[PDB]
Structures are given as structure tokens and as C-alpha cells.
């Protein structure tokens, strides 16, 4: 649905050539044939994707998903760090504020939780 | 200076390649029949594992109070250092092991399950 | 669809959460029950050791790289020379800087021989400090025992090795003992008679073990440790002999992959040592072995013999005497440990 | 379902043939090394090498490159799971050892020396 002919667009992905030897039509495979032309500390992201990936937060989670489904791991690497680094230097509270994501978790759990793994919080 | 290479997996492997020999009945040498049946086994693992066919050896016919049931395992044990056990033939392996005097075997094993 | 991408797809927040340094992953555990079991699986991965060296410096250093370590700690190991780190408050700074679980190892050191952090294939130096931060891996065992030379008492009791996992231990591999203010050499033969490799020697003092003396060490149990062992004795002094006995030691045929070279080497040697040359061990090393960081010391003494042990094979030298093969001085012990995978 | 693992069972059997073959009761393999007899098992003989089992399978003289002192340790890890090196037999035990191929012998035990 209104692919790119040339194959080498999708040589990186693995899905495709199980059946050689699909999610949505939107500007998604666009983005993904444009990234296609062009310790695991994220700090080294290219200067290239991390400019390409400017887009909504909404957009980067639906490249993430066309990414997972297409088995693209460098594209699904470099999502992981854009969030990971947006995650970073952010406590639970925010990152649950950020992302909008309801608790169903109960009180004295969370005590637990953050009582076993208490050593991060020193300086 | 005089070195020593010990290894430890050289009797674990010469084991499971006289298994091998066993199954396969190449270079096999003492035949046992036990209730009509016939087993096969090399002489010098036999005498080894137990003292009762270390003083019979130096065609073995297993008398009458013994079963194939019980002996069947102890072969395999003998060739593999391993002895699977149920609940209906613990009894019999542990009188077989006790009638043969079989070496290295442990008779908590027999025990925790009696 | 924001909140439906890390609340359903558990692939996508484990790739997302592997990013994340081990302090964050902790920070992140308590987000969601399944980002929960996604850091408790992330760190069920996580079986590299990962070592935070110091071209005091190391103490604010580890401070600064306590964020970008990817791995929860269990086994600390960390090294000082002599005269930065010499003075306990230093040693109580870095003890409470570790997690309460994590038990904490911390020798001082007349030297220290020590690669540049990041990557193993990073020419090693001689001397600061450097750390060793052993996680929680499955299999391997390690434990810190710690034995103090009492003032009326002098034998050491079977019920003290067997806990700290000595003696009555079928699997243990490595012993690494280092001695301060040297009682080391009867601790040592209690256990030399083993099929382990004992490597270490003879240090300054002790810092953290969550002054007097007594033998300090781990012991890396487990059935998947497959290390090696040589004493570049006298006999080796130039770069052709160092050179000879690391492609000796090769020939051991350790793999590379989750493996310190620990170098065991004497305070009395090196540039000192060596005419007109420095660094002949550790470059030997590095050109032998492109990974495989080289740590280890300077120390007074040195325990270790020429063995090579394995999940398969033992190969120790004959002795006439059991605990003679192994104490040495003015020698090299370049042990290998290897921590399966 | 108890599945007892004994953990001696292995070297004491290899430990109990050993003795068996030091008193030259049950053996049934004679090796003629440099002229010297060595007294020996046909399976355990076959299972600790290569050549042996192609040999002895389908039925011994070993050729003049195998010396005597090179094939007393090799015989002797072969009934007891442990090889002896000296200065002297160890170039000899590991040309045997490359040409008998024996198994449970890595190469490593000769050159790091």
C-alpha cells in the first residue's frame, strides 16, 4: 500500500523478508523511508535522527509501534533512546503526570517498592 | 617441575562411551540372564561397580529372588552414574543394590522414599 | 495512544527501560507493575561487570559514574594506591555510596594497574585507583570473607572457611586473597590444597569490608568460572620474555568475553625493574589479549602459582610441599578470571 | 521420581579399572610399545582414543613412533583421569597425544608450560 519500489528501503527490516523468501498508510512509511536513506549510553544519538524525530509525541509513539511491526532495529533503537533520554532526570510522579498513565497500584506497596531500591536516592 | 593435567570430566565421558558400547553391544563381554532374559555389559565395568560380580566373574545366571525390574535400572546406573526410580520399584532396586553390594550408591536415597 | 504504548506493548518499554542507567531503572521500577517486571527482568540481563578506573580522585569519580552504570552492584570491588587514599572517612564516603545490600570490597595498595574505563580494549597503565562492580550474576557466587588476626587465638576454625564458603564448596574456582600488614601464609595453605586458582599478594590496608591484619578476598564460586594463571618469574625482564610467557598464557585458551586480567605484580618491579622500559607487562597484556581490562596491583608479595582451572580440566604442578608452589616475591601473576555467560 | 546423581561414581569406577589393570586380572588387550607389554581393556582402551577404537573394533602393535615413555602417561590418564608431564616426555606425550588424538586432553597443558 503505496510502497516505495526499490527493495533497499527495506533490507533493514527483518519482517518482510519472512514472506519475501501493515499497520497504517499514513506519512509513517514516509518517515521510515526517510530514515531509511539516511556500555549503550543514548548520549551518542546522530545528529540526523534526533533532528528527524522533531515530531509529536503521538507520532513518535505511532514510528515506535510502524518500527516494533516491521522489525527495524535501528529505527526502534533510536526511538528508545529519544524516550529514554526524555525519561531521564524525571522522578515516578512526573513521569506518570507526562505520560498520563493511571495508578493501580496500592499504598504500601509503593512503600516497599521504593524502600527495597532505596539507593538511588543518595547523591 | 613436573605438571599434572587432571581432568575432570575424562570419567564422565569414558562412562557414557561404555554406555554407548552397551547399547550399541560392541566390545560387550559378560551376558546376564535374569528371569529368561538376556542383558548385556562389559566384565571389568561389572566388576568394578559391584563386589558381588567382582567375586563371581573372578554367562551369569541371576538367581531367582531378584527381578528384571530391579535390575534393568541398576545397569543404567552402573553405566551412567544416574538411577531413575519409582514408587513401585524403590523397594526392588533397594534390595537388588543390597543383594549385589553396588558401590558408590548411597542408601539415604532408597530411605527418603521408603 | 501515548499511555497505550507503555502500558501494552512490554517489548517496547524493555527496549525503552535498557537505556536507562541502573539508578534510573530503579527510580522507574516503581512507575507501573509492568514496568516493574520490565526493570526486574532488564536487570536479570545485566551480567556484565563494569569497572569505574581514576587516571583522592576515584572516590568523586565513581560519584560522577555512579549515573551512567548500567548494572545494580552486588560485589563491589575497588583498589587505592597508597598515599591518595592515605584516613577511614574516605573509606566510610564510598561505603555509604553503595547500595546496603551490596557487599563492598576495598583494598589499598602501594600500586595500581588499572585501563581506562568504558571499553576493555583500552591500553592499560601502571601506578588513584579504579573500582569493580560485580553485579548479581546467576551462577556465580561471589563473597568477600575477611579474616582478622586475632590477638590470643591462631588457628582458624573449619565452621569460619565453610561459611565464607571456602572449604565444604564443590564449586568454587577462584580464590583472590590479598594480605595487609604482613598469618596470610597458614589462612592460604588452609585452602591451597584445592582445586581452585589462588591468585593475589600482599597489600597496604583495608578499607571497606561490609589497621591490624589478617587476609581479605573473594571467593568467585560457581560452575561456569574457567580461569588461568603464570608467574613470570625472574626469568622474564624484558619485553621478549613478557611477551613469550603472555602468548604462553594464551595458549590457555580463557575466553575473552565477561574476563578481568587481573596482573598480580610485585611493588619492587616495573620501570625500577625493567631497563629503560615501561609498561612492558601491561602492553604485553593489551597485545595478547585485546580486551580483558588488566587490574590488579603493586604489592609486597605475591601468592599464585602457574595453574589453569576450568569447568573440564585442572592443570596444577606437582609439589613436594603443598603451600610452597605458590607464595612468591619479585614475580608477576597474570590470573584471568572468567565469569561464564 | 528420585533421579540420584552420584557424583563419585564416575572416577571411582575409572579409579576401581585402574587397579584392575595394575593387577593384570580381566584385561584382554595387550600393547607392544618399543617391545614393552602393557595390559589393558579393549573398551576402555577404545573409549579414551581414536585410533584405539579403530583398531580394536573389528577384531596390538603400535607403530615406532610412539616411545614407551611417551605412552605410560598417556595410558595412565587414560585408566585414571589424570596425565603427568615432565620436562623431558612432555614433547613426547603431546606428539602421542596428537597422533592417538586422545580425548579429554586439550593442547593448552603443553605449550603454556
Given at each position: 500500500?503505496?510502497?516505495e519500489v526499490d527493495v533497499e528501503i527495506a533490507k533493514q527490516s527483518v519482517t518482510i523478508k519472512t514472506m519475501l523468501e501493515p499497520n497504517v498508510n499514513a506519512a509513517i512509511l514516509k518517515k521510515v523511508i526517510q530514515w531509511c536513506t539516511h556500555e549503550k549510553r543514548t548520549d551518542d544519538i546522530p545528529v540526523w535522527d534526533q533532528e528527524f524525530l522533531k515530531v509529536d509525541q503521538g507520532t513518535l509513539f505511532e514510528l515506535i509501534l510502524a518500527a516494533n511491526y516491521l522489525d527495524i532495529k535501528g529505527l526502534l533503537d533510536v526511538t528508545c533512546k529519544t524516550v529514554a533520554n526524555m525519561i531521564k532526570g524525571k522522578t515516578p510522579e512526573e513521569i506518570r503526570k507526562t505520560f498520563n498513565i493511571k495508578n493501580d497500584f496500592t499504598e504500601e506497596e509503593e512503600a516497599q517498592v521504593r524502600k527495597e531500591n532505596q539507593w538511588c536516592e543518595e547523591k | 617441575s613436573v605438571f599434572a593435567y587432571e581432568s575432570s570430566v575424562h570419567s564422565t565421558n569414558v562412562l557414557l562411551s561404555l554406555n554407548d558400547q552397551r547399547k550399541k553391544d560392541v566390545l560387550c563381554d559378560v551376558t546376564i540372564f535374569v528371569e529368561g532374559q538376556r542383558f548385556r555389559a562389559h566384565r571389568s565395568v561389572l566388576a568394578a561397580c559391584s563386589s558381588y560380580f567382582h567375586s563371581r566373574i573372578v554367562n551369569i545366571t541371576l538367581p531367582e529372588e531378584v527381578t528384571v525390574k530391579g535390575f534393568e535400572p541398576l545397569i543404567q546406573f552402573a553405566?551412567?552414574?544416574?538411577?531413575?526410580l519409582s514408587?513401585?520399584?524403590?523397594?526392588?532396586?533397594?534390595?537388588?543394590?543390597?543383594?549385589?553390594?553396588?558401590?558408590?550408591?548411597?542408601?539415604?536415597?532408597?530411605q527418603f522414599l521408603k | 495512544r501515548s499511555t497505550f504504548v507503555l502500558?501494552?506493548?512490554?517489548?517496547?518499554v524493555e527496549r525503552v527501560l535498557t537505556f536507562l542507567p541502573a539508578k534510573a531503572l530503579l527510580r522507574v521500577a516503581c512507575v507501573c507493575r509492568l514496568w516493574r517486571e520490565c526493570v526486574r527482568r532488564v536487570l536479570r540481563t545485566h551480567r556484565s561487570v563494569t569497572w569505574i578506573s581514576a587516571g583522592h580522585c576515584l572516590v568523586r569519580v565513581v560519584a560522577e559514574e555512579l549515573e551512567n552504570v548500567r548494572i545494580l552492584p552486588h560485589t563491589v570491588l575497588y583498589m587505592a594506591d597508597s598515599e591518595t587514599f592515605i584516613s577511614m572517612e574516605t573509606a566510610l564516603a564510598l561505603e555509604k555510596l553503595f547500595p546496603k545490600q551490596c557487599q563492598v570490597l576495598g583494598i589499598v595498595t602501594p600500586g595500581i594497574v588499572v585501563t581506562p574505563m568504558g571499553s576493555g580494549s583500552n591500553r592499560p597503565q601502571e601506578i588513584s585507583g579504579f573500582a569493580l562492580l560485580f553485579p548479581q550474576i546467576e551462577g556465580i557466587k561471589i563473597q568477600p570473607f575477611h579474616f582478622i588476626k586475632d590477638p590470643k587465638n591462631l588457628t582458624l576454625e573449619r565452621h569460619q572457611l565453610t561459611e565464607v564458603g571456602l572449604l565444604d564448596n564443590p564449586e568454587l574456582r577462584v580464590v583472590l586473597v590479598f594480605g595487609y600488614n604482613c598469618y596470610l601464609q597458614q589462612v592460604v595453605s588452609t585452602f591451597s590444597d584445592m582445586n581452585i586458582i589462588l591468585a593475589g599478594g600482599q597489600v597496604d590496608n583495608l578499607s571497606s569490608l561490609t589497621d591490624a591484619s589478617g587476609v581479605v578476598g573473594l571467593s568467585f564460586s560457581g560452575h561456569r568460572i574457567q580461569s588461568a594463571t603464570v608467574l613470570?618469574?625472574?626469568?622474564?625482564?624484558?619485553?621478549?620474555?613478557?611477551?613469550?610467557?603472555?602468548?604462553?598464557?594464551?595458549?590457555?585458551?580463557?575466553?575473552?568475553?565477561?574476563?578481568?586480567?587481573?596482573?598480580?605484580?610485585?611493588?619492587?618491579?616495573?620501570?625500577?625493574?625493567?631497563?629503560?622500559?615501561?609498561?612492558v607487562e601491561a602492553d604485553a597484556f593489551r597485545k595478547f589479549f585485546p580486551s580483558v581490562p588488566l587490574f590488579g596491583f603493586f604489592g609486597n608479595g605475591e601468592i599464585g602459582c602457574d595453574?589453569?582451572?576450568?569447568?573440564?580440566?585442572?592443570?596444577?604442578?606437582?609439589?613436594?610441599?603443598?603451600?610452597?608452589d605458590l607464595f612468591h616475591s619479585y614475580t608477576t601473576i597474570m590470573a584471568l578470571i572468567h565469569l561464564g555467560s
Open positions: 500500500e503505496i510502497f | 553405566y551412567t552414574a544416574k538411577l531413575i514408587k513401585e520399584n524403590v523397594d526392588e532396586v533397594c534390595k537388588c543394590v543390597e543383594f549385589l553390594s553396588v558401590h558408590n550408591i548411597e542408601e539415604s536415597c532408597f | 502500558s501494552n506493548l512490554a517489548e517496547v613470570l618469574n625472574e626469568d622474564v625482564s624484558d619485553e621478549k620474555t613478557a611477551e613469550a610467557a603472555m602468548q604462553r598464557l594464551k595458549a590457555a585458551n580463557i575466553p575473552e568475553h565477561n574476563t578481568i586480567g587481573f596482573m598480580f605484580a610485585c611493588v619492587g618491579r616495573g620501570f625500577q625493574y625493567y631497563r629503560a622500559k615501561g609498561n595453574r589453569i582451572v576450568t569447568g573440564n580440566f585442572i592443570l596444577r604442578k606437582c609439589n613436594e610441599v603443598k603451600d610452597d
